Amino acid sequence: TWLSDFPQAWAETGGMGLAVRQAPLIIPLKATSTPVSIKQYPMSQEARLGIKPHIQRLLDQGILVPCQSPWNTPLLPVYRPVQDLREVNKRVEDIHPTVPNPYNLLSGLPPSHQWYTVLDLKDAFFCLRLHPTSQPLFAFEWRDPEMGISGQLTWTRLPQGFKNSPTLFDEALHRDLADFRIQHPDLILLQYVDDLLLAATSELDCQQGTRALLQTLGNLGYRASAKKAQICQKQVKYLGYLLKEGQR
DNA sequence: CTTACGT
DNA sequence: AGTAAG
């Protein structure tokens, strides 16, 4: 089965990812920026208890670490933690947006390629490391009033809610898949951040190309959702479109 | 929580 | 001058 054949490639079996070929990212600030420290709006016990197991898992995974930082932005409970990084985003230097819009991306799908595999990378941003010099930027406060600990945590990986994460991830995965494209010039590979479409001429070519892509992704440290994967189908859902007999 | 359009 | 998103 596709599951047991590629244990490293699936999030279900391969552990949390880590893009081992990608250097830890340095996040340049705008020329005039200084740190901003926003105090944490008090959180209800219900919200804190809802968020806590997620924080603990991220700590265990090394994705969060304790820190002391002159930067601080608030968490809101939505329960899962959502960080309001808008004041950090304002102080970080802009980069050119290189993620194509889905309409244009899909124009690169020729009618000769009607066998599809769609993969969704799990916890994609967390696969990219942050350089230690840039980690303090993203700090937030975490307290356990029944455990005594009251200090800051920050991210060791590219965080959710940071304005440049989608573009930085898209560019990093493009670098890591450049050789795959060269070794498989008969295949079409569309990348939209963490959403991938592979297109082939035939069921066999799609099967072989999908095996090659899963092997490559897992080897590089990325992880795809086995649950959501659409493997070697003539009909798939990709980026909100239904892809059927060349249409859409 | 806070903060950035259309009647 | 009463929605969506971090």
* DSSP track, A187-221: SEEEEETTEEEEEESSHHHHHHHHHHHHHHHHHHT
CATH of the domain at A204: 3.30.70.270
Q: What are the start-end ranges of the H helices in chain A? A: 2-5, 11-14, 45-60, 86-89, 102-106, 165-183, 203-220
Q: Are residues A116 and A172 in the same domain?
A: yes
Cite the annotated binding site of A for RNA by residue number: 41, 84, 86, 100, 164, 166
∠ Cα A180 A181 A182 (to 5°) = 90
- What is the tally of structural domains in chain A? 2
Q: Rounded distance, CA A8 to CA A5, Å?
A: 9
Domain membership of residue A114 (yes or no) is: yes
Together in a domain, A172 and A206: yes
A217 and A113 housed in the same domain: yes
Is A164 domain-assigned? yes
Query: Do the beta carbons of residue A223 and residue A121 sit within 8 Å?
Result: yes
Angstrom distances, CA of residue A238 to CA of A92, A125, A216, A222, A244: 32, 20, 21, 19, 11
Closest CA to A118 of A1, A17, A213: A213
- Å between CA of A87 and C1' of C3: 21
- Which residue lies nearest B4, CA-to-C1' measured? A86
Residue A136: closest CA among A24, A16, A10, A27: A27
Solving technique for this entry? X-ray
- Which residue segment(s) compose the domain that A118 sits in? 2-27+95-128+158-243
Instruction: From the CA of A183 to the C1' of C3: give the distance in Å.
Output: 48
Regarding whether A208 and A141 lie in a shared domain, the answer is no
Task: Return positions of chain C under 7 A from a protein CB.
Answer: 6
With beta carbons less than 8 A apart as the criterion, state whether A164 and A95 touch.
Answer: yes
Do A17 and A82 reside in the same domain of the chain? no
Buried-exposed string A136-145: b where 16+ CB fall within 10 A, e elsewhere: bbbbbbbeee
Encoded tokens for A119? 């993969």
Q: Stated in angstroms, how far is A86 CA from B1 C1'?
A: 13
Domain match, A72 and A174 both: no
Distances in Å between the alpha carbon of A96 and those of A99, A105, A146? 9, 17, 45
A87/A206 same-domain check: no
Considering the domain architecture, whether residues A115 and A215 belong to the same structural domain is answered as: yes
Would you say residue A248 lies in a domain?
no
Resolution for this experimental structure (Å): 1.6
